[PDB]
Design a protein around this ligand. Structure first.
Ligand SMILES: NC(=S)c1ccno1
Ligand SMILES: NC(=S)c1ccno1
Lengths: 217, 207
């Protein structure tokens, strides 16, 4: 089994849905996903979770006190704390394979301006902490990135991307709107099909992701 | 305004939620791909030609769905780990589009003829949001929608360094004193250096 805790100020957005890969995983008892409203650990009347940044700048920064109290209750020393952020280490397929063997992931969802850095620094004295980016784009907060990470990881768990791009794929019918499936794919010749698909893959990779083959992007 | 149509066999999963950025909402409609299936079994995929594992999404089903939802002005977005990379620059570009249609399929793919055919009468962009595989494009659609919509007015280099707020001392850690100094040129220089060190440590590829 695996336990995933997600902490967010948008709990409804992160509520697991039965008809989904994570929903299936949950139902098969392979993972338990629990979502927590960050505001549960506030004490003030207007349940404030953020404040203006020291040093100036646009936006707000999430308060360390509230996150501190939440992670105190949810995490143990065995927890792998995941914090989505544009500023993080890259989250890759390798990362997904690695986290697929973890007993307990806690995903801290915060606005992109950041959670006060002292939260992650403090947590790091007790547990493993991974600040990660799923890609080079900005979201308002970590929530969508958490859903991506959960998807990528849960499909790898026992019971539930190489280094090239997969080429085009086809299915029936063999002709459609005047466009024909590549005759080699209909030929039954596994060796020539494998050769064709290898070529297509390399051709697609050169065009769309030349960086994967060690060329200028 | 902006119109976004999402096509998926998981419409519940992609149903917009009020308590979110996209909920603050610009028009977003989610369509169940099964609405365009031809058989009582509501089949949306089939075995890949040439063999191999997994399934490939049927072109006859997707072709109908797209014929109905797309127009000449449509930008057809297809999330796929085999795509061109989706970046901030892409999100900016798409932020001024009048009509996005996002075709969510399983990662093995939609029959290539669907995109090829569509590209003869509309603009088509197959894109990847990162180097990892998901079972389907659904979560990637959420990310794309999140990244694009926050750039639409009225729906609101180096790595950013650490940020801080009150209190000035917390569990033994003090906010860097430079930040409370009132020397704003120095603060900018300090932040530049923090950004440089973080970019070196976490994303050396950017330098
Ligand atoms: N690119 C990531 S992980 C992100 C999180 C919040 N905003 O962007
Ligand atoms: N990396 C992307 S966009 C993806 C979609 C489905 N599987 O991976």
């Amino acid at each position: 089994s695996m336990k995933i805790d997600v902490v967010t100020i948008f709990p409804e957005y992160l509520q697991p849905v039965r008809q989904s890969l994570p929903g299936k995983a949950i139902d098969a008892g392979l993972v338990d996903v629990a979502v927590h409203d960050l505001r549960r650990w506030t004490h003030d009347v207007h349940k404030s979770v953020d404040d203006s940044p020291y040093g100036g700048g646009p936006g707000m920064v999430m308060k360390p006190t509230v996150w501190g109290d939440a992670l105190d209750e949810i995490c143990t020393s065995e927890t792998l704390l995941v914090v989505p952020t544009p500023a993080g280490y890259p989250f890759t397929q390798e990362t997904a394979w690695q986290w697929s063997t973890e007993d307990h992931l806690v995903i801290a969802c915060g606005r992109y301006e950041g959670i006060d850095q002292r939260v992650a620094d403090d947590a790091a004295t007790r547990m493993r902490v991974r600040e990660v980016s799923i890609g080079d784009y900005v979201l308002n907060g970590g929530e969508a990135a958490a859903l991506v990470i959960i998807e990528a990881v849960l499909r790898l768990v026992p019971g539930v991307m190489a280094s090239l791009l997969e080429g085009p794929s086809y299915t029936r019918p063999p002709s459609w709107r005047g466009m024909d499936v590549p005759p080699v794919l209909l030929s039954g010749d596994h060796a020539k099909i494998a050769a064709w698909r290898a070529e297509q893959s390399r051709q697609r990779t050169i065009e769309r992701r030349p960086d994967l083959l060690g060329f200028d992007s």
